[PDB]
Design an enzyme around this catalytic site. Structure first.
Site, short mmCIF file in Angstrom:
data_model
loop_
_atom_site.label_atom_id
_atom_site.label_comp_id
_atom_site.label_asym_id
_atom_site.label_seq_id
_atom_site.Cartn_x
_atom_site.Cartn_y
_atom_site.Cartn_z
CB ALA C 12 -0.97 0.01 1.19
CB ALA C 99 5.50 -9.62 6.65
N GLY C 144 1.48 -7.21 6.76
CA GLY C 144 2.59 -7.61 7.62
C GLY C 144 3.78 -6.67 7.53
CB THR C 145 5.66 -5.30 4.66
OG1 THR C 145 6.00 -6.63 4.26
CG2 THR C 145 6.86 -4.37 4.43
CG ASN C 206 -8.29 1.18 1.72
OD1 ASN C 206 -7.89 2.20 1.16
ND2 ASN C 206 -7.59 0.03 1.73
CD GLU C 254 3.65 26.59 10.10
OE1 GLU C 254 4.69 26.62 9.41
OE2 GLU C 254 2.66 27.34 9.90
N1 GTP Z 1 -5.62 2.28 -0.53
C1 GTP Z 1 -4.85 1.23 -0.76
N2 GTP Z 1 -4.85 0.23 0.10
C2 GTP Z 1 -4.08 -0.82 -0.12
C3 GTP Z 1 -3.25 -0.88 -1.29
N3 GTP Z 1 -2.62 -2.04 -1.25
C4 GTP Z 1 -3.01 -2.66 -0.14
N4 GTP Z 1 -3.88 -1.93 0.51
C5 GTP Z 1 -4.49 -2.27 1.77
O1 GTP Z 1 -3.42 -2.61 2.64
C6 GTP Z 1 -3.78 -3.75 3.41
C7 GTP Z 1 -2.93 -4.95 3.02
O2 GTP Z 1 -1.57 -4.70 3.27
P1 GTP Z 1 -0.44 -4.57 2.22
O3 GTP Z 1 0.14 -3.22 2.27
O4 GTP Z 1 -0.87 -5.02 0.91
O5 GTP Z 1 0.64 -5.53 2.89
P2 GTP Z 1 2.19 -5.39 3.00
O6 GTP Z 1 2.54 -4.19 3.83
O7 GTP Z 1 2.69 -5.51 1.66
O8 GTP Z 1 2.59 -6.67 3.86
P3 GTP Z 1 2.83 -8.22 3.46
O9 GTP Z 1 2.42 -8.30 2.06
O10 GTP Z 1 1.96 -8.87 4.40
O11 GTP Z 1 4.27 -8.46 3.72
C8 GTP Z 1 -5.23 -4.02 3.08
O12 GTP Z 1 -6.07 -3.34 3.98
C9 GTP Z 1 -5.38 -3.46 1.71
O13 GTP Z 1 -6.69 -3.08 1.39
C10 GTP Z 1 -3.31 0.27 -2.17
O14 GTP Z 1 -2.64 0.36 -3.18
N5 GTP Z 1 -4.13 1.24 -1.85
MG MG Z 2 3.00 -7.30 0.45
#
Ligand code: GTP
Ligand code: MG
Ligand code: ACP
Ligand code: GDP
Ligand code: 8WB
Ligand code: CA
Ligand code: CA
Ligand code: CA
Ligand code: MG
Ligand code: MG
Lengths: 424, 347, 440, 55
Positions: C12, C99, C144-145, C206, C254
């Site tokens: 994300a 993760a 996880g990450t 989201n 700020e």
């Molecule tokens: N708005 C938005 N949410 C996202 C996106 N990608 C993932 N998410 C949200 O992020 C959460 C999932 O985590 P990710 O960020 O995909 O996981 P990660 O940090 O890559 O961790 P691991 O893959 O578990 O190692 C969920 O709630 C998804 O809906 C994105 O591009 N945009």
């Molecule tokens: Mg990931």
């Protein structure tokens, strides 16, 4: 994101061979390993299951194991038999005589190091191995006894990798020998400890679907395997094709398995038809949750879903999918545990399977699976109470105590499931 | 089908609403904590409004307006009236009131000294919300006994001008109060139930002795326990509108509609329009409705005064069926439709 | 001029980072190859856009950004995408395997192995800063990450850059947008560990972005691309003051000075208007009064909650486009007589206003129509605690049965970290209650 | 209702409106201990597994 596939014994190799035929056709791989597809979506995750060879050929990351040659000669003569790496056929000559002890302790132990040599070679050419999938039956000797021996040795060598099995449970309705409940009870105890996720494929359910739903008066093993191979393709869709879900076998285990021992899944598939008619999204979703489409002969109304994964394949309205999926839950909310929020996960893939405009695959972690282990437990005890047929196992060096322990372990498993069926 | 949860087991009203919902065949009651509901019949206290409206694919509706407590506690009602320009300190239908902590202790004595110096009637009443279930009320003519009483109870109280000249039913020379039930739906339509109840005193009104308090407090529990003559005039010390209207005609040559009900509708509308921007669920991610009990007093000039607003009222026994059916029709089925009107809509 | 380093962690964080830097390039006139024909100082300069971009001798404008993910497939899209030329390879960091939606695996198991490398790459960017002000950190709560590695990195950033400010952009989990079952666990674990280390954090639910894309953009099933281009508009309007000439929110310090008077309550609510469909053939342009009024509608908030039933501690209005102060005050006057706006007693009732005359930039071909004026409201209201309550409830339901806890203990986390983190959240919800509600 | 601190540049302007007036961190070593303690618990659990498999 590589997976190493292992198929063991008669059932394991016949269902395994069908799986590779089905997914080779989905990825555009012909029986000589040449790609002749039309979409690059077919090739994006081809490496999860296939190695690329010298001449731009694709080779299944598949190891074929048996204690007798017959079924593996059949695989080699089969439709896609030339696709497998010849060095990956590992087999003896004695057989296992439908005997878990022969597979696990005597004949199998003589062969198992050779299998691990091939497993080690396939793992070495993996960029980053996810883990392993095993296809086997629990009612015979090689798949059941040598298969679980194999799982134990793989865990010792790769303790941080995921182990996933497709395990065919025996049924008196589709039975080869009376000792199947012994072999299955000995195996379940191994699976409880040494797999992370196990698809429970019940031959009783397969038979009932062929008979009652598909209107086959005389089901054969081949008819049963058609259902298995379609289900195996369904549950691996998200490993094999791109989608918004960015998840592998470990993410599957993390979200499907709330307690380590309760990792035995009920798979299902829709449509099953005895056909050119359009299936609507409401119908597809109704059938996928119907007991009659489940592959473990357990009634989901007799328990509660801890977690569910649903995978839809085809070009359909995702909006309608969500609506039906929410509808199914909001209607039958007494069959989902309320202490795991959002425990039903929906995934989608644009590529439909061969011959269907759309399909749906169901993976349920339900406490009703306990009915399967109770049934095996009852058949076990009816013989073991009189020590019937035990000489076949004690002649391989086993003791009665090991049977008593496997029986208690499965009864404990059943009690663990029952503890969460009333959990509120 | 539609789904609902029940979180108030002591509600006589929504017990009956829920009984009606199940009998339609189209509603199913879920467990107390199942989040996949369309309708929440919520708890009186700490209703978790922040968990509503986040379930994908469920239109969710709750039977309480978040923030309506401002109108439905004795202290905050006085505060709301004084500080809201729509209502204002120059509000003619609400008695002179002050909030006292054990703060308006000073200004209350300022007006008290003014009245007593002018030899005017100086009888006040001290009451509170924590003083529930028919006790914790003091009617006195001396401010000393009123302030000394609040400090001993130890909770936020209101002191209010006691209406010394009530309208007295005849025969019996007796006091009463009017309960009106009002339903506010999710579109903030204001519906007044046609049927009100007069909750009567059974004992003649005695202006000399305020210590007895059976002929001064009209609550159904104080008349059921401490009152002789309980039931002789009306069953259960409850007079309904038809009899009361007939009385106003025979006795005072007027009607309930003209002499009283225009003021009641005016007061209801004023109170609920005042808080509408604070509590409206228009454009919100979940919807609210709520049933209110407005309590009124009538003086001997047929002037109507608001006494309090109840946020979780009960209903008179003979009126439970009609009003509960009306709640399903107007507040629930209007949002969740199934496969003459008993309410006056106040525009 | 004082530099800001952006850090994007997990899927994300990375995908949102791509949407932001793409939009930044359009806003500053930077082509995908990094050239900026309007920057007449070749190879250097201390202009406001240099807070976010460094400069090479060849006139190339390079984001002060690090992208971190524990598997390679999302960052590999950055490496081959439209803006692949923008970043050095040193800035894009990938591990071998992710993760698995497990905070403990991102924090302990994998994080221990990659953290020193990440800090080395950030140090390389810091060493090019004459006066680094701190960090902007983008991540999900749910991954996880995004959860586990972010909290480890924030702790180490506090050690290595003690005097530097740290702001978060955090994606709060919603079932309508690809959530995992264990995301409430990961959200609570990372909020507990990051709380002391973050000075200001902008939560984006989201669910709210999803519904804005459905209602206002008429997109039936929003993708991450739809979601992220809307998010990057909100992010852009929050960071515009660091990247353009101005006198409000001119440095990271700020942000906390203006939005966060109580250090633990550092989660401002963002509200944005207008969001107009580019496919809308006929559109009537909205006045200052109408976009300002829209800032008090729950439906335009980055987190769905009801500010009428909380109190404000601070409120900032950030306008882009054709806006003059006189319209803003006339609009504020009207709204104060119509809406329930209550500040806490120990704070002044008022608004800090910033206006930037350039209207929002829109991505060619995107979903968002170009408008003549837009506003982002940042308000520190206790109503945002409704999101913590919702998350803590879901945590409590699973944790009472210890569902999935074994996955975290198996990575070397002690079970007690769960209840320690839950206890911190309980104190947080209590803090919002003491600040924001009066006794009934 | 008063406007204060009006600043103007060619890019825009900023100002304030006041409607009403009012009325420790872990060290590097400590982080290292935590990460090593978790790894030791992982090693302990893996040694128990391999012990179990040896039996
Ligand atoms: N708005 C938005 N949410 C996202 C996106 N990608 C993932 N998410 C949200 O992020 C959460 C999932 O985590 P990710 O960020 O995909 O996981 P990660 O940090 O890559 O961790 P691991 O893959 O578990 O190692 C969920 O709630 C998804 O809906 C994105 O591009 N945009
Ligand atoms: Mg990931
Ligand atoms: N200001 C006043 N002047 C004269 N009589 C009053 C009065 N306020 C209250 N009373 C009398 O005292 C009774 C009790 O007052 P109050 O309304 O505070 O009780 P309560 O809160 O129990 C009503 P409910 O049971 O509907 O909630 C009223 O019904 C009325 O008869
Ligand atoms: N579904 C299915 N079940 C099979 C097949 N072959 C055997 N079985 C079942 O598997 C069990 C016997 O094990 P089998 O695999 O033949 O023995 P093995 O060769 O020693 O592993 C019994 O329960 C059979 O009903 C098959 O091809 N398909
Ligand atoms: C590799 O394929 C998968 C990996 C993960 C999941 C999955 C399942 C279930 C969940 O909740 C019960 C979930 O939150 C996330 C992912 C999943 O289900 C969609 C998968 O397809 C079956
Ligand atoms: Ca031999
Ligand atoms: Ca320059
Ligand atoms: Ca710090
Ligand atoms: Mg056989
Ligand atoms: Mg009352």
């Amino acid at each position: 994101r590589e997976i190493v596939h292992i198929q063991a014994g008669q059932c394991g190799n016949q269902i395994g061979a069908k799986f590779w035929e089905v997914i080779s056709d989905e990825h555009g791989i012909d029986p000589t390993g040449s790609y002749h597809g039309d979409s690059d979506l077919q090739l994006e995750r081809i490496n999860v299951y296939y190695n690329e060879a010298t001449g731009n050929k694709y080779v299944p990351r598949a190891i074929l194991v048996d204690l007798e040659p017959g079924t593996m000669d059949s695989v080699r003569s089969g439709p896609f038999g030339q696709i497998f790496r010849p060095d990956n056929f590992v087999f003896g000559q004695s057989g296992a005589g439908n005997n878990w002890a022969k597979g696990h302790y005597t004949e199998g132990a003589e062969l198992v190091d050779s299998v691990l040599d091939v497993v080690r070679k396939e793992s070495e050419s993996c960029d980053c191995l996810q883990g392993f999938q095993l296809t086997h039956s629990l009612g015979g000797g090689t798949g059941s006894g040598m298969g679980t021996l194999l799982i134990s040795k793989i865990r010792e060598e790769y303790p941080d990798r995921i182990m996933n099995t497709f395990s065919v449970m025996p049924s008196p309705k589709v039975s080869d020998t009376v000792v199947e409940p012994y072999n299955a009870t000995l195996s379940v105890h191994q699976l409880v400890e040494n797999t992370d996720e196990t698809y429970c494929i019940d031959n009783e359910a397969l038979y009932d679907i062929c008979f009652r739903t598909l209107k086959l008066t005389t089901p054969t093993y081949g008819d049963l395997n058609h259902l298995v191979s379609a289900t195996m393709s369904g549950v691996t869709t998200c490993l094999r094709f791109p989608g918004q879900l960015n998840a592998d076998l470990r993410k599957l285990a993390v979200n499907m398995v709330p307690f380590p021992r309760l990792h035995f899944f009920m798979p299902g598939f829709a449509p099953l038809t005895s056909q050119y008619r359009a299936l609507t999204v409401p119908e597809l979703t109704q059938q996928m949750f119907d007991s009659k489409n489940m592959m473990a002969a357990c009634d989901p109304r007799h328990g509660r879903y801890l977690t569910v994964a649903a995978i839809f394949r085809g070009r359909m309205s995702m909006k309608e999918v969500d609506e039906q999926m929410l509808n199914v839950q909001n209607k039958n909310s007494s069959y989902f545990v309320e202490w795991i929020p959002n425990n039903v996960k929906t995934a989608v893939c644009d590529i439909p399977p061969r011959g269907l405009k759309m399909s749906a695959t169901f993976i349920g972690n339900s406490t009703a699976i306990q009915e399967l282990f109770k049934r095996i437990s009852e058949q076990f005890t009816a013989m073991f109470r009189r020590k019937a047929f035990l000489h076949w196992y004690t002649g391989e060096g086993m003791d009665e105590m090991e049977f008593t322990e496997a029986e208690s372990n499965m009864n404990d498993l059943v009690s663990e499931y029952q503890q969460y069926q009333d959990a509120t | 089908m539609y789904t609902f949860v029940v979180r108030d087991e002591n509600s006589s009203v929504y017990a009956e609403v829920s009984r009606l919902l199940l009998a339609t065949g189209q509603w199913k009651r879920l467990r107390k904590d199942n989040p996949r509901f369309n309708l929440m019949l919520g708890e009186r206290n700490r209703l978790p409004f922040g968990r509503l409206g986040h379930e994908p694919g469920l239109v969710q509706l709750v039977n309480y307006y978040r923030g309506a407590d401002k109108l439905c506690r004795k202290a905050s009602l006085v505060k709301l009236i004084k500080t809201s320009p729509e209502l204002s300190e120059s509000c003619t239908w609400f008695p002179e009131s002050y909030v006292i902590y054990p703060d308006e202790r000073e200004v209350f004595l300022a007006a008290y000294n003014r009245r007593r110096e002018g030899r005017e009637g100086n009888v006040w009443i001290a009451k509170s919300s924590a003083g529930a279930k028919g006790e914790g009320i003091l009617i006195s003519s001396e401010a000393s006994e009123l302030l000394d009483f609040i400090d001993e109870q130890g909770q936020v109280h209101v002191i209010q001008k006691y209406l010394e000249k009530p309208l007295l039913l005849e025969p019996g020379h007796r006091k009463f109060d009017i309960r009106s039930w009002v339903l506010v739906d999710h579109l903030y339509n204001i519906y007044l139930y046609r049927e009100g109840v007069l909750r009567t005193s059974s004992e003649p009104y005695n202006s000399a002795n305020f210590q007895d308090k059976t002929c001064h407090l009209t609550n159904h529990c104080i008349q059921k326990e401490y009152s002789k003559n309980y039931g002789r005039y009306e069953e259960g010390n409850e007079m309904f509108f038809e009899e009361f209207n007939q009385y106003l005609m025979d006795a005072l040559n007027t009607t309930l509609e003209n002499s009283i009900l225009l003021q009641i509708k005016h007061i209801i509308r004023s109170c609920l329009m005042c808080i509408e921007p604070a509590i409206s669920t228009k454009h919100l991610h979940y919807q609210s409705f709520q049933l209110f009990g407005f309590d009124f007093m009538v003086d001997e000039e047929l002037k109507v005064w608001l006494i309090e607003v109840n946020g979780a009222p009960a209903c008179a026994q003979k009126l439970y069926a009609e009003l509960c059916q009306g709640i399903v029709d107007v507040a629930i089925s209007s949002v969740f439709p199934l496969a003459t009107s008993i309410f006056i809509k106040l525009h | 001029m004082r530099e800001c380093i952006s850090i994007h962690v997990g899927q994300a964080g990375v995908q949102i980072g791509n949407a932001c830097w793409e939009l930044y390039c359009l806003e500053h006139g930077i082509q995908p190859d990094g050239q900026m024909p309007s920057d007449k100082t070749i190879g250097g300069g201390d202009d406001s856009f240099n807070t976010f971009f460094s400069e090479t001798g060849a006139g190339k404008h390079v984001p002060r950004a690090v992208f971190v993910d524990l598997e390679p497939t999302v960052i590999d899209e950055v490496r081959t995408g439209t803006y692949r030329q923008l970043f050095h390879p040193e800035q894009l960091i990938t591990g071998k395997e992710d993760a698995a939606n497990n905070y403990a695996r991102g924090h302990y198991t994998i994080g221990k192995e990659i953290i020193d490398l990440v800090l080395d790459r950030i140090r390389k960017l810091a060493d090019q800063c004459t006066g680094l002000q701190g960090f902007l950190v983008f991540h999900s709560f749910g991954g996880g990450t995004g959860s586990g590695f972010t909290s480890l990195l924030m702790e180490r950033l506090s050690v290595d850059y003690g005097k530097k400010s740290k702001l978060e952009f955090s994606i709060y989990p919603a079932p309508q947008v690809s959530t995992a079952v264990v995301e409430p666990y990961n959200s609570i674990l990372t909020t507990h560990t990051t709380l002391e280390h973050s000075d200001c954090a902008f939560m984006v639910d989201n669910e709210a972005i999803y519904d804005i894309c459905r209602r206002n953009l008429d997109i039936e099933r929003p993708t991450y691309t739809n979601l992220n281009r809307l998010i990057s508009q909100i992010v852009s309007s929050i960071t515009a003051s660091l990247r353009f000439d101005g006198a409000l929110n001119v440095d990271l310090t700020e942000f906390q000075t203006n939005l966060v008077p109580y250090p633990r309550i550092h989660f401002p609510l963002a509200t944005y208007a207008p969001v107009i469909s580019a496919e809308k053939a006929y559109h009537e342009q909205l006045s200052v009064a109408e976009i300002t009024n829209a800032c008090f509608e729950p439906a335009n908030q980055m987190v769905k909650c009801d500010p009428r039933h909380g109190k404000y501690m601070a409120c900032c209005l950030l306008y882009r486009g054709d806006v003059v102060p006189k319209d803003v005050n006339a609009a504020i006057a009207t709204i104060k007589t119509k809406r329930s706006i209550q500040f806490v007693d120990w704070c002044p009732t008022g608004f800090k206003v910033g206006i930037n005359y350039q209207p929002p930039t829109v991505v060619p071909g995107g979903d968002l129509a170009k408008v003549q004026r837009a506003v982002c409201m940042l308000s520190n209201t206790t109503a945002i605690a409704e999101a913590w309550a919702r998350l803590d409830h879901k945590f409590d339901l699973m944790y009472a049965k210890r569902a999935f806890v074994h996955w975290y203990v198996g990575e070397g986390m002690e079970e007690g970290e769960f209840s320690e983190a839950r206890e911190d959240m309980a104190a947080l919800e209590k803090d919002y209650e003491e600040v924001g509600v009066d006794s009934v | 209702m008063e406007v204060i601190e009006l600043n103007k540049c060619t890019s825009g302007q900023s100002f304030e409106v006041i409607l009403k007036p009012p009325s420790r961190d872990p060290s590097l070593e400590e982080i290292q201990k935590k990460l090593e303690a978790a790894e030791e618990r992982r090693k302990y659990q893996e040694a128990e597994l391999l012990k179990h498999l040896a039996e």
